[PDB]
Scaffold this active site. Structure first.
Site, PDB file in Angstrom:
ATOM      1  CG  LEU A 167       5.489  -0.159   2.362  1.00 29.09           C
ATOM      2  CD1 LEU A 167       4.942   0.584   1.162  1.00 29.09           C
ATOM      3  CD2 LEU A 167       5.453   0.720   3.594  1.00 29.09           C
ATOM      4  CG  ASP A 168       1.255  -3.615   6.565  1.00 32.39           C
ATOM      5  OD1 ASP A 168       0.397  -3.013   5.888  1.00 32.39           O
ATOM      6  OD2 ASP A 168       1.652  -3.208   7.675  1.00 32.39           O
TER       7      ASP A 168
END
Ligand code: CDL
Ligand code: CDL
Ligand code: PC1
Ligand code: PC1
Ligand code: 3PE
Ligand code: 3PE
Ligand code: 3PE
Ligand code: 3PE
Ligand code: PLC
Ligand code: PLC
Ligand code: DGT
Ligand code: MG
Lengths: 140, 55, 70, 98, 347, 49, 88, 99, 120, 320
Positions: free
Chosen positions: G42-43
């Site tokens: 995930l960013d």
């Protein structure tokens, strides 16, 4: 609630058990309905089914007590040939008290109810014999 | 067994604790006007349907 | 032989909302000392109305956004 | 009792049952109180007019006077109820005995 | 509230009560009730806080509903008798409606739920008017219609009040709800003897008013509205603790105190009519009332509860409140038993 | 002077003291006349005197 | 009646369930110790959206300074405990 | 601590200060007077005069009279040959049996 | 019951016929107790307001006693009147209904048969 | 006629005596900031009544002969002991602060009662509005427990709402190092144990919580140490204020009647200072409470209600 009682004191004691049992079951059921009326109204259930479920539990419990009491006291005067004996109601009352212990699942409540219902039931018969009055008409 | 338990248990202790429970029921209300007035409707119907007070 | 008199713990029994706590009345709180409850937060918003631009009194090109109380 | 008395007494009961069964709005239950006054007014007017009870003909008029002294009083509390909470919901009047 | 407005509003409450008492017309009696209800609400909302609004809102709804029933009974009686006189009703259905209506205004169970609530939300002075002066009018109408009141209806309400009243107060720590439930239980004794002897209804009502008024006055003197708050009085006005003890004992019906007279005379009348079971049940059931009166004495007079350091600052100031009629009321509320036969003056 | 302030009850309210004593005297005088008058009319009607 | 107490095992189900609903986390390899950035990929914003769901889950406000450190589901369960004092 | 309260006081010993104390009071002057009134009105008045009063009660419940009365009747009813005691306590001539 | 005592005179404290009764004598033990209650009120009034109980405001205490006795005396007049009315109505009714209150036929214990129960 | 409903109806209103000069001024400032002397001058030049700051024995001055009573009849709280051992285990810190707040509340009620009845202005030195500053310092210095602060707010929150704020707030500002300087050459050795941080906390609370909130409802004036030296400048600023905000503009006869009926009755004022919240700092045992109260009642002129004590020369008791 007058007719049902009249149908219960117009039958000879210790005889016609089936007729007396219906009367007591009706009186018991009516008491359990009024209890369920207020309980439903004051403590609102969380769903419609939980309301009839609550009413069924309370009405059945009161009709069970009414049925057993009327049944036990009717035969006991039949078996002993002692119609005018408050002891028959004492046996009947404590029999009803026992059921209240069973349906509530508590020996103490069953024990306490047997004595207090048994004493209450006996006093009911004494007053009918002696003609006591709970709501006495004014006389003087 | 007799003086400190069973004589206490039957008359004093049980008669006391029944009042405690009967008090919590009659006072376990929430002050909701909706629920009280519904109870009045029940009382008025009961006074007739069952007890025939109107007669 | 100083005679026993109610201590702090004894008095607390009579400080609650009710004498006999139950499942239900556990959360009941004592009423305010002076009977005044705290006022509530933002409740009601002023009505918002566009007084233009297509209005006789808006001179055609005035979008006058107003907040009205009545 | 003629067949009209059934409907006026039937109307009074409907208002009475309506009042005792609150939904959510307090204003909705104030109308039922005013509705009961209208039933009693009509029922008195039929009774008094029918029997030619002449002096009693002023009773229904006096009835309306205090019929509105409640409505005025009832609306006064409704203003004070909504000021505290912003709406006339009856479930907000639960500070007492709870 | 402008002091002039307070008097005029008060004089309207009394006028509403007095109109009900002197009227001989079912229309004026209803007007009296409406006038009384009109001028009682402002006294509840003399402080404008959320609890006063709820109490006034609940009080208005209950009494207005009761009034509709009382006016409905008056109209049915007009149809079946063609007259407005304030006497026995001429229809069984109207008597039931009027009896329930009056029971709603008095607060007798099962129409009792509002009494604990209204009293808690209004000042002590307002509660005194609600629990003493607001019974005079509803009682003066039962006094004139008792022949037609149904026997089973009236007694059932009384047996419910004495039970609901006794159990309710066991669980309360607020002084304004202990007196709220004490009121309900005492309504049961007043209305239980009404069918048999209305004169004893007045006596039970007069003693109730004095004892209630004395209790509220002593609460107002120290500004105490909780059980704990009343527990600090032994450190401010020790003489005030003893008076509360005597009055509370009397309210419980203990001899030789005045509060035993109404109970004593009620039992006599019921027995003379061959009503043995009911007075016995009422008398025993009143031990519930005496119990939660005894807890107040334990926390107030018979023991010394913990105090606070800032209490020492109050020692240096006198009690500046009016406490009107308090010395006279305290005597009448404990030392009237030797003058019991004086009750004949009520007839 | 002892107190720093003047107590509201520093001196008698002689108006109050005058009225208090006047009412007490009046009622006793009124009552004593009442009892005497009651006794006379009681004898007159019963005919014993 | 008084509601059931919050227990560290109760919180754990809530966090994982909330993460399970998230459509960017693969349910196969979402462990109570897995890392949002390195493990799940995930960013940053993807991480910010998860923390927003947790606020809806337990109904309380989380400052941005704290959410910068909730880099794996474990510390979320720890953080919830610290706020509700669930030592368990 | 949980509150502010004086420590436990220690019981006073009256012999600590007044070795001749009668235990009635801490004031030797009053204490002596407390003993005197108890001893005088108690032992010298109630017990002594009261005991003498009881011993000379005037024929408590006519126990002496009944003795002299029985002697006269036994004396009287033996000279005339009558029975000492008649089995009937009431005169039959003035009794009407139910039948 | 005596509310409508067939005499009109409604809402009168002491009807005119009440003047035919002997008024209470001022030495009445009932009246003295009522006065004593007044004195107790005076002491209580001093106490609650923190004044020397037995000494403060003698003028005030004298008014408590007199006010209590004044009202007490008139209540005794009405208390005694009501009871006098009760017997007057009770006897005249008996006189007007000979049959409902028949003179009894009395027998002596030498003719009345009572069951005997030994205690042994 | 003791003031009440009848006196009001008979025509004793407050506006009939209130004037544009009837003001309630309050001089604040950190410890040793000259507020004591300055407030004395403002009263004289403007002709107001001066109220010395309410210490432990303020209430004593208002009743009886005015001489202070022994310490035990004032809670036993010692200001110096707070300096000596601010973190003591007998809770002297909060009992002192709790006691002091009641003193200010009683004093503030005294001020308003004079203002409304007589119509003359009044000058106070701190008040119930600025009393929390010391409590704020104590909590942040670990002198009072958390529960103590909660108790203070409850007592404050139910009393301070019944009274109107002051007309003018005169804040005398002095930097903390200057306060430390003006204490060293001040004498009293106990104060010399005051830490700087304690004064900083008072300074932080005063400016940041108190001054910001008073401005929106009162006319705040701020003066430095040098400006405070001359009271003539300040008396000029005060007399040219505009008085165009705060709740004192919308008070009429009806509302001041409700206020006046409260401040003349001193027991109604002190009602909530003794709420039955059993905090160990202010709780007192029954045996100790009974002992002290029986000693107080036998002090000279305290046995009976004032005016009925015979031992202090009062006469005519039997007719009074
Ligand atoms: C049985 C016989 C015993 C009956 C016992 C009667 C005495 C009751 C206890 C008195 C309590 C007391 O000391 O007063 C404190 C208390 C003060 O309350 P507060 O909250 O501090 O302030 C009140 C206002 O906010 C203050 O407003 P304000 O400051 O703006 O000024 C307005 C002024 C207003 O002053 C007045 O009170 C006006 C006087 C009106 C009475 C008129 C009498 C008839 C002419 O305030 C007052 O109320 C004056 C103080 C109260 C003195 C009351 C003295 C008369 C009471 C006795 C007569 C009872 C008659 C029934 C009362 C009305 C029923 C609804 O007074 C009351 O409010 C209670 C009023 C009485 C209600 C109970 C009535 C008893 C019902 C049974 C009667 C049986 C017949
Ligand atoms: C029918 C005839 C009855 C005659 C009653 C005459 C006395 C009533 C007037 C007393 C009065 O002004 O205050 C009552 C009353 C004052 O209430 P309070 O708290 O009882 O007064 C006590 C103070 O010590 C009040 O005293 P103070 O220190 O404020 O000033 C001395 C006071 C002296 O006033 C007093 O002595 C107060 C005590 C008088 C007795 C009050 C109770 C009423 C007595 C009749 C009820 C008896 C009980 C029923 C009998 C039951 C037994 C069968 O002077 C006067 O008031 C002169 C009154 C003559 C005008 O005024 C009102 O409440 C408004 C009306
Ligand atoms: C006209 C005349 C009217 C007269 C009215 C007089 C009514 C007076 C009676 C009212 C009270 C009614 C009885 C209440 C009984 C309640 C007992 C109960 O619920 O069971 C609890 C109890 C259970 O208690 P438990 O299981 O919690 O254990 C008790 C001990 N502790 C608390 C330490 C754990 O049941 C009993 O065991 C009581 C036995 C009573 C036996 C009956 C004796 C009859 C004589
Ligand atoms: C008016 C305010 C009423 C406040 C008191 C409310 C409770 C009163 C309860 C009844 C009081 C006693 C009634 C009997 C009585 O002595 O008074 C009426 C007496 C006797 O009248 P009565 O015999 O016709 O009785 C009237 C009241 N009932 C029927 C309820 C008993 O009359 C008077 O006192 C004359 C008063 C004239 C001047 C005033
Ligand atoms: C002589 C002519 C014939 C007369 C008729 C004779 C038949 C009489 C019929 C008796 C009917 C008894 C009515 C009792 C109603 C009980 C209602 C009920 O069932 O609930 C009671 C309650 C159980 O409810 P609960 O499980 O707690 O609900 C869920 C809560 N979470 O459980 C409880 O809380 C216990 C409390 C219930 C006990 C109520 C008091 C007893 C009822 C009075 C009976 C006295 C007479 C009985 C003997 C007959 C006398 C003739
Ligand atoms: C289920 C819920 C409970 C209700 C069902 C149980 C109770 C019903 C039975 C008792 C009610 C009276 C029944 C009745 O109608 O008969 C009255 C009887 C004499 O009349 P009877 O012979 O039966 O009929 C012909 C008379 N011409 O006379 C009698 O019955 C004598 C009654 C004596 C009662 C002794 C009880 C002592 C304890 C007091 C309890 C009541 C106190 C509360 C008051 C209730 C208020 C409604
Ligand atoms: C013939 C002579 C007899 C004449 C009888 C007249 C009565 C006839 C019906 C007329 C309409 C009565 C008024 C309607 C009552 C009402 O307003 O209902 C209020 C109440 C609102 O409940 P709410 O909060 O909205 O949520 C419901 C969730 N269950 O509603 C509810 O809680 C549930 C819905 C109830 C609706 C059915 C009740 C109407 C029948 C009542 C009969 C009473 C006897
Ligand atoms: C508790 C006790 C509280 C007592 C409160 C005081 C009530 C008694 C006060 C009476 C004082 C007497 C005043 C002087 C009497 C008088 O001069 O008469 C004037 C007036 C009526 O006179 P009247 O006879 O009607 O004139 C026409 C005659 N052809 O006289 C009157 O009308 C007097 C006014 C009526 C007073 C009410 C008295 C009735 C009883 C009141 C309730 C007290 C009952 C006590 C019960 C206790 C039982 C233990
Ligand atoms: C009829 C109109 C008035 C009302 C009726 C009152 C009459 C009685 C007035 C007594 C005079 C008074 O006030 O004296 C009161 C004085 C002074 O009290 P004290 O010594 O502190 O009392 C406590 C006693 N010690 C000091 C011993 C502890 O007590 C006496 O010496 C008692 C005599 C009066 C007995 C009653
Ligand atoms: C009783 C009682 O108790 O009256 C309480 C108060 C007096 O209280 P106070 O001012 O303290 O005087 C008492 C103490 N004195 C004497 C030492 C100062 O009287 C009043 O409010 C009376 C108000 C009268 C004005 C009425 C206006 C018109 C009303 C009629 C319109 C229909
Ligand atoms: N703990 C505490 N001490 C207080 C409080 N109010 C005053 N004091 C103390 C602090 C000081 O030692 C003393 C007086 O403080 P001041 O502000 O008046 O300083 P001082 O009189 O020495 O000089 P000054 O007023 O500037 O002229 O009273 C308070 O609310 N809490
Ligand atoms: Mg200083």
């Amino acid at each position: 609630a007058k007719t049902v009682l009249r149908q219960y004191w117009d039958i000879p004691e210790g005889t016609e058990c089936h007729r007396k049992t219906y009367a007591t079951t009706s009186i018991g059921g009516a008491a359990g309905l009024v209890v369920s009326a207020y309980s439903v109204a004051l403590k609102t259930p969380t769903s419609f089914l939980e309301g009839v479920a609550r009413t069924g539990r309370y009405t059945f419990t009161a009709a069970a007590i009414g049925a057993i009491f009327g049944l036990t006291s009717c035969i006991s005067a039949q078996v002993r040939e002692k119609p005018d004996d408050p002891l028959n109601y004492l046996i009947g009352g404590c029999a009803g008290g026992l059921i209240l212990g069973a349906r509530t699942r508590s020996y103490g409540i069953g024990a306490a109810a047997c004595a207090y219902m048994g004493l209450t039931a006996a006093l009911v018969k004494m007053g009918q014999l002696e003609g006591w009055q709970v709501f006495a008409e004014p006389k003087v | 067994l007799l003086d400190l338990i069973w004589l206490e248990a039957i008359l004093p202790k049980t008669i006391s604790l029944a009042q405690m429970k009967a008090s919590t029921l009659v006072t376990n209300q929430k002050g909701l006007i909706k629920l009280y007035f519904l109870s009045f409707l029940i009382t008025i119907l009961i006074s007739m349907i069952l007890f025939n007070f109107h007669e | 032989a100083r005679q026993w008199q109610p201590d702090v713990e004894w008095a607390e029994q009579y400080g609650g909302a009710v004498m006999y706590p139950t499942k239900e009345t556990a959360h009941w709180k004592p009423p305010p000392w002076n009977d005044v409850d705290p006022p509530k937060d933002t409740l009601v918003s002023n009505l918002t109305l566009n007084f233009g631009p297509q209005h006789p009194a808006a001179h055609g090109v005035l979008r006058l956004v107003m907040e009205l109380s009545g | 009792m003629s067949m009209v008395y059934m409907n006026i007494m039937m109307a009074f009961t409907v208002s009475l049952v309506g009042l005792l069964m609150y939904r959510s709005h307090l204003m909705s239950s104030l109308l039922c109180l005013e509705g009961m006054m209208l039933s009693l007014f009509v029922m008195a007017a039929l009774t008094i007019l029918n029997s030619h009870f002449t002096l009693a003909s002023m009773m229904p008029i006096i009835l309306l006077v205090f019929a509105a002294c409640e409505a005025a009083l009832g609306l006064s509390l409704l203003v004070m109820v909504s000021n505290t909470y912003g709406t006339d919901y009856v479930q907000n009047l639960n500070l007492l005995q709870c | 509230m402008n002091p002039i407005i307070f008097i005029i509003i008060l004089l309207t409450i009394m006028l509403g009560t007095i109109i009900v008492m002197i009227s001989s017309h079912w229309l004026l009696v209803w007007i009296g009730f409406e006038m009384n209800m009109l001028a009682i609400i402002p006294i509840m909302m003399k402080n404008h806080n959320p609890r006063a609004t709820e109490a006034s809102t609940k009080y208005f709804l209950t009494q207005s509903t009761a009034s509709m029933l009382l006016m409905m009974a008056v109209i049915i009686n007009l149809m079946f008798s063609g007259q407005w006189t304030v006497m026995k009703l001429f229809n069984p259905m109207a008597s039931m409606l009027m009896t329930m209506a009056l029971a709603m205004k008095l607060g007798m169970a099962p129409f009792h739920f509002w009494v604990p609530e209204v009293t808690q939300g209004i000042p002590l002075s307002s509660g005194l008017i609600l629990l003493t002066w607001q019974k005079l009018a509803p009682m003066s109408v039962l006094y004139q219609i008792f022949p037609s009141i149904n026997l089973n209806l009236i007694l059932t309400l009384s047996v419910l009040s004495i039970l609901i009243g006794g159990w309710g107060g066991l669980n309360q720590t607020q002084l304004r709800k202990i007196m709220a439930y004490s009121s309900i239980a005492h309504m049961g004794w007043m209305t239980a003897v009404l069918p048999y002897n209305p004169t004893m209804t007045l006596l039970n009502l007069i003693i109730y008013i004095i004892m209630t008024s004395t209790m509220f006055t002593m609460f107002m003197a120290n500004s105490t509205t909780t059980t704990l708050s009343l527990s600090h009085t032994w450190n401010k006005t020790p003489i005030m603790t003893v008076l509360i003890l005597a009055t509370l004992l009397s309210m419980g019906g203990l001899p030789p105190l005045s509060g035993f007279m109404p109970k004593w005379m009620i039992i006599q009348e019921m027995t003379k009519n061959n009503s043995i079971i009911l007075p016995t049940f009422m008398a025993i059931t009143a031990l519930l009332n005496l119990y939660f009166y005894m807890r107040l004495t334990y926390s107030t007079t018979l023991t010394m509860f913990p105090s606070t350091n800032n209490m020492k600052m109050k020692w240096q100031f006198p009690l500046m409140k009016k406490m009107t009629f308090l010395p006279t009321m305290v005597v009448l509320s404990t030392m009237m038993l030797p003058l019991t036969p004086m009750l004949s003056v009520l007839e | 002077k002892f107190y720093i302030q003047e107590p509201p009850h520093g001196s008698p309210n002689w108006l109050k003291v005058g009225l208090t004593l006047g009412t007490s005297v009046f009622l006793w005088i009124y009552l004593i006349k009442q009892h005497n008058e009651d006794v006379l009319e009681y004898k007159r009607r019963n005919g014993l005197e | 009646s008084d509601a059931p107490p919050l227990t560290l095992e109760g919180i754990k189900d809530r966090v994982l369930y909330v993460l399970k609903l998230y459509d960017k986390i693969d349910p196969e390899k979402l462990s109570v110790n897995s890392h949002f950035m390195k493990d799940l990929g995930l960013d940053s914003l993807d991480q910010v959206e998860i923390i927003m769901a947790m606020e809806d889950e337990f109904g309380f406000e989380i400052p941005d300074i704290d959410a910068e450190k909730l880099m794996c589901p474990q510390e979320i369960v720890d953080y919830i405990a610290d706020k509700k004092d669930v030592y368990e | 601590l949980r509150w502010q309260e004086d420590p436990e006081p220690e019981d006073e010993n009256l012999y600590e200060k007044n070795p001749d104390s009668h235990g009635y009071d801490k004031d030797p002057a009053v204490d002596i007077w407390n003993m005197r009134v108890v001893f005088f009105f108690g032992f010298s008045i109630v017990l002594v005069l009261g005991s003498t009063f009881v011993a000379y009660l005037p024929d408590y419940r006519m126990q002496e009279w009944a003795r002299r009365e029985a002697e006269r009747l036994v004396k009287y009813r033996e000279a005339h040959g009558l029975p000492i005691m008649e089995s009937n306590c009431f005169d039959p001539s003035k009794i009407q049996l139910p039948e | 019951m005596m509310t409508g005592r067939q005499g009109r005179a409604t809402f009168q404290f002491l009807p005119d016929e009440a003047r035919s009764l002997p008024p209470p004598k001022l030495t009445d033990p009932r009246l003295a107790f009522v006065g004593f209650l007044g004195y107790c009120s005076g002491l209580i009034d001093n106490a609650i307001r923190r004044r020397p109980v037995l000494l403060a405001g003698l003028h005030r205490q004298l008014l408590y006693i007199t006010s209590f006795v004044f009202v007490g005396y008139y209540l005794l007049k009405r208390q005694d009147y009501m009871y006098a009315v009760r017997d007057h109505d009770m006897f005249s009714y008996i006189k007007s209904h000979p049959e409902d209150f028949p003179e009894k036929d009395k027998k002596t214990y030498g003719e009345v048969f009572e069951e005997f129960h030994p205690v042994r | 006629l003791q003031y009440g409903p009848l006196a009001y109806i008979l025509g004793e209103k407050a506006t009939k005596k209130m004037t544009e000069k009837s003001k309630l001024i309050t001089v604040d400032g950190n410890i040793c900031s000259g507020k004591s002397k300055l407030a004395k001058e403002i009263a004289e030049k403007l002709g107001l009544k001066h109220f010395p700051e309410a210490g432990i024995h303020y209430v004593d001055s208002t009743t009886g002969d005015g001489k202070p009573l022994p310490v035990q009849f004032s809670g036993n709280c010692s200001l110096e002991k707070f300096y000596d051992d601010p973190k003591s285990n007998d809770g002297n810190s909060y009992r002192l602060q709790a006691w002091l707040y009641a003193s200010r509340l009683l004093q503030y009620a005294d001020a308003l009662e004079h203002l409304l009845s007589t119509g003359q202005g009044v000058v106070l030195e701190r008040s119930i509005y600025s009393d929390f500053v010391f409590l704020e310092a104590m909590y942040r210095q670990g002198f009072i427990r958390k529960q103590c602060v909660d108790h203070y707010n409850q007592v404050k929150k139910v009393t301070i709402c019944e009274y109107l704020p002051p007309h003018v707030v005169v804040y005398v500002d002095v930097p903390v190092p200057e306060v430390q300087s003006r204490i060293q050459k001040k004498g009293n050795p106990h104060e010399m144990k005051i830490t700087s941080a304690y004064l900083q906390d008072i300074e932080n609370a005063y400016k940041g919580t108190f001054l910001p909130e008073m401005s929106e409802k009162c006319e705040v004036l701020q003066y430095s140490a040098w400006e405070a030296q001359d009271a003539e400048k300040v008396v000029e600023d005060i007399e040219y204020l505009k008085y165009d905000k705060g709740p004192w503009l919308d008070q009429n006869d009806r509302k001041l009647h409700k206020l006046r009926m409260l401040v003349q009755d001193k027991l109604e004022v002190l009602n909530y200072t003794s709420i039955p919240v059993f905090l160990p700092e202010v709780t007192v045992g029954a045996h100790q409470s009974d002992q002290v109260f029986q000693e107080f009642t036998e002090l000279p002129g305290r046995k009976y209600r004032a005016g009925y004590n015979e031992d202090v020369g009062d006469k005519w008791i039997w007719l009074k």
